[PDB]
Design a protein around this ligand. Structure first.
Ligand code: LBN
Ligand code: LBN
Ligand code: 6OU
Ligand code: 6OU
Ligand code: 6EU
Ligand code: 6EU
Lengths: 580, 289
């Protein structure tokens, strides 16, 4: 075999590699003319279809070798006279699918895909799926990397393959096909964060006369420099499969461009449509009930009985009856919040690494309801430590009231700033501040002998050095030291190091954040409103699920089979002067 | 040729071009001789010289240079292994980069006197920026977390033995038949041993570098602080055996200084490693003016 392999390598006329595959691989400038001889010799004596049996490169055949090399003539010769299941092509490796046509499409080889698709000797199957279930369009969308030229040719190839498949097979619906996981090419582009492919798919009009029915953004009329466009909105607002809007919003936040992935033509106005139509009165009746429950909880916490031990027997007074009713309403609200929070994590199962960075408002609403259930537990088992939990519940809830500024734009970017500092710029600076506080507090408490004023306490001396950070500390707070020149050196060093060097450095860090999330979070607020709209829509499913459905059913054209095309469209308008 | 370099796009361009041409021509006439290995009297090599003098352009050229020609390809560093599609995996030569008989490129860039212009971003060249990471992940992230833990476990031996010091009489203090006194004595011994270790680890560091005074505080600040901590406690040892009660004023300074030096170990974290670099720069520049 060495002479044959050596001659094939010389280009002179386990792994399981064949001479044809070896010859094709070891070809320079397409000079491997011995491949024809082997194929011709093989014909005189199944050989062309032989493939490597190695698990790493399982399934690779001659067609793949020629396709990779961009050889039109070699590909045509091989075709005229399979799927690579190897770990190299499964999700150092390159994924393109597991079909020759997917190899052609994923590499921009437009001519080769045309040749394969309508190859007279053997045509390829457009709708075939690999092991993962991905079709061709799934591979094309997966390959996307969000670059102007990259998005350019991926969208171009998608459009070309789509038109060609429609021309050969008008009946079949290619986009509706799904992989094993269940997603569609549009849903996949929405989930994976590929903004370019989503922007293409959502608003794509193909002008050609016959194959116009596979388009979304139509036109209704144009009198002058003005024209009103439609949209298709098929699986956008709601569908059997996951909707584009829900996927973008309920995404794990690992998706790159979630915040500004809603600026595409339909979504940015479909979201607004829902907000104005039937949600602005359900985000103002939910705010009012919360404001009316925090005056039932506050007024019943402020007038709690002070004499004796709990529980307290009722008295024949109107005040006591009202207090009992207030307590019942408060506890009912607490239980409702606890369940509304418990059955939210089961729906998402958010990862710990992003438990606080994506659901902060909900974590807080849950943590509030824990403190009050703990109070219910402690108050019936004859304890008076239930006040320390009711108080925390009250303060936490009043400060959670800020969650409802989610609707306002000017104020919705002010409760987004208090989430971001408390997470990023106030947990670093307390790792870098307690070090100084404890170092100098241990120093000072060790210097003083003390072996009343009672400044021999590591608690009192840690506290008194924290009032040097709010500018409310007495320098001569003790006189028990034996070495004044050291004590008043330590304090004066501490004041400079923390009051003047650390506080005035944390302010700069918060200033940078305030700029950043003051000129960026304008889209995070829109996203938060989008989640609010989605949850509000989900809550009232029983009431007006179908009744409050966006978009109107309209005729678009004629399905190629001969029937009529009716779809749920959303109308938009525009004005343009320079085009005429 | 490397010495003449001044780090300009066109300047780097023709210096690199001339270097490549002279190298190829010398290889063609004399393939046997290794020209780069030659050194001047000081001992440096052209690559080591480009690394020491701060010439980033020549270093970037030399580290990753592939010459495609068929015969004279053996004088190259950045090869290629395979390319299936739009993907290709490159190699590198890393001959005297990680370690060598002559000074390594990595050590020269790091242990430089800091007069070198571009030290901070002179490690972005192809090999170094990932070779450094390789070492970090492979066998150093568990030696910068066992060195942090021992320091955190020694500052709870020093603090707990400083906080419970005897208050009655004059030093030294005779031992008592109590478990508390034995534990205090052990804490003192451990603390003093740590102090001596730090003092020697600091004294034999300056001999290795002999840093200039003008850049004594601008390049070794973390080490100056670790040394100054160990001086205060050796002074305390000196004063405490010679029957004085002024050793508390030094032990206290040692304790505070060490707790605040704990910040040196945020060197590994990225988000927190740029917060202890800000407290060095203000205290030097914006709080002495
Ligand atoms: C009665 C109808 C209550 C349901 C309306 C609603 O969504 O409210 C809710 C409040 O309502 C309550 O929690 C109060 C429950 C007790 C009622 C006593 C006061 C009555 C005077 C409104 O709020 P929500 O949007 O349900 O949840 C807010 C927090 N998450 C869960 C969105 C993060
Ligand atoms: C025992 C092994 C000690 C060596 C490990 C090491 O590098 O530590 C060292 C600390 O270790 C000590 O200084 C403590 C020494 C006394 C031990 C008592 C506590 C035991 C419980 C770790 O720190 P380092 O990196 O050696 O130096 C940090 C400061 N410079 C010198 C790098 C600037
Ligand atoms: C940043 C640093 C954060 C934490 C480092 C923890 C190291 C603590 C070292 C122990 C010092 C010590 O002995 O303090 C003891 C404990 O001091 C305290 O009050 C609690 C110390 C925990 C502080 C952590 C924050 C002495 O108090 P006592 O013996 O209860 O009363 C005396 C009569
Ligand atoms: C910034 C510093 C601002 C104020 C600190 C004190 C002002 C310096 C005056 C020096 C004169 C002096 O030593 O005073 C003597 C007393 O000095 C002392 O008691 C200790 C002085 C140490 C203070 C300097 C340390 C500052 C360093 C901070 C970093 C005599 O006066 P008396 O005994 O108080 O009566
Ligand atoms: C993230 C969590 C678990 C958190 C829970 C409590 C303990 C909390 O302290 C923090 C940390 C903290 C503690 C003290 C001062 C600052 C920060 O922040 C909140 C948490 C911080 C707040 C308010 O936080 C906010 O920024 C309001 C807010 C911003 C954005 C939102 O979308 C939002 O919706 C609920 C609420 C108030 C407290 O809940 C409160 O009243 C008490 C007693 C402590 C505050 O821990
Ligand atoms: C540079 C030197 C010699 C220095 C030595 C001592 C006296 C020091 O005051 C300074 C000047 C000073 C004094 C008082 C307030 C601010 C600054 O800064 C440090 C020095 C400043 C510090 C902490 O300095 C830091 O920024 C921490 C740090 C930052 C970056 C690092 O790489 C680092 O590694 C060790 C440590 C704390 C003290 O050591 C301390 O605890 C006491 C009692 C004085 C501080 O002189």
């Amino acid at each position: 075999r060495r002479s044959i392999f050596d001659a094939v390598a010389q280009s002179n006329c386990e792994t399981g590699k064949t001479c044809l595959l070896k010859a094709m691989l070891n070809l320079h400038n397409g000079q491997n003319d011995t491949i024809a001889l082997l194929l011709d010799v093989a014909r005189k004596t199944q050989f062309v279809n032989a493939s490597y049996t190695d698990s790493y490169y399982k399934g690779q055949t001659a067609l793949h070798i020629a396709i990779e090399r961009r050889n039109m003539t070699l590909v045509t010769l091989l075709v005229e006279n399979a799927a690579a299941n190897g770990d190299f092509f499964k999700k150092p490796g390159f994924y393109f699918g597991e079909l020759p046509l997917s190899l052609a499409a994923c590499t921009n080889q437009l001519a080769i895909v045309k040749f394969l698709l309508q190859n007279s000797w053997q045509p390829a199957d457009i709708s075939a799926r690999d092991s993962v279930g991905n079709t061709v369009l799934h591979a094309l969308v997966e390959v996307a990397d969000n670059t102007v030229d990259n998005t350019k040719f991926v969208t171009s190839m998608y459009n070309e393959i789509l038109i060609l498949g429609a021309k050969l097979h008008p009946t079949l619906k290619l986009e509706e096909i799904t992989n094993r996981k269940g997603l569609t090419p549009l849903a996949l582009a929405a989930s994976s964060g590929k903004i370019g492919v989503l922007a293409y798919i959502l608003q794509r009009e193909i002008h050609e006369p016959e194959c116009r029915h596979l388009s979304r953004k139509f036109t209704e009329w144009a009198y002058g420099p003005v024209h009103s466009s439609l949209y298709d909105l098929s699986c956008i607002d709601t569908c059997e499969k996951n909707s584009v809007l829900e996927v973008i919003a309920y995404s794990s936040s690992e998706t790159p461009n979630r915040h500004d992935m809603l600026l595409v033509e339909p979504l940015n106005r479909l979201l607004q449509d829902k907000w104005d139509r039937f949600v602005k009165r359900i985000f103002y009746f939910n705010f009012f009930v919360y404001c009316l429950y925090m005056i039932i909880f506050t007024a019943a916490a402020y007038y709690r009985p002070v004499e004796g031990l709990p529980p307290y027997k009722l008295k024949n007074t109107v005040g006591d009856y009202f207090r009992v009713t207030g307590e019942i309403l408060s506890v009912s609200g607490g239980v409702y919040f606890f369940f509304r929070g418990i059955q939210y994590f089961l729906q998402r199962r958010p990862s710990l690494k992003s438990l606080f960075v994506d659901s902060y408002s909900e974590i807080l609403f849950f943590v509030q309801s824990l403190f009050m259930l703990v109070s219910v537990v402690l108050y019936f088992s004859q304890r008076k430590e239930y006040v320390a939990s009711m108080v925390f519940s009250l303060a936490m809830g009043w400060t959670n009231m800020l969650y409802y500024t989610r609707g306002f734009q000017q104020m919705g970017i002010y409760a987004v700033m208090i989430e971001k500092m408390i997470l990023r710029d106030l947990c670093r600076f307390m790792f870098v501040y307690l070090v100084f506080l404890f170092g100098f507090s241990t120093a000072v408490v060790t210097l003083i002998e003390d072996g009343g004023n009672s400044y021999n306490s590591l608690y009192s001396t840690c506290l008194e050095l924290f009032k040097f950070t709010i500018g409310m500390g007495d320098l001569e707070f003790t006189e028990n030291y034996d070495f004044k020149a050291v004590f008043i050196i330590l304090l004066l060093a501490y004041v400079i190091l923390t009051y003047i060097l650390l506080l005035n450095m944390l302010i700069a860090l918060m200033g940078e954040t305030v700029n950043k999330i003051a000129q960026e979070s304008k889209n995070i607020w829109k996203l938060q409103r989008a989640i609010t709209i989605l949850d509000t829509e989900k809550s009232f499913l029983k009431c007006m699920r179908k009744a409050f459905r966006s978009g109107k059913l309209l005729q678009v054209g004629f399905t190629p089979d001969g029937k009529d095309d009716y779809r749920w469209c959303f109308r938009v308008d525009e004005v343009n002067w320079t085009t005429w």
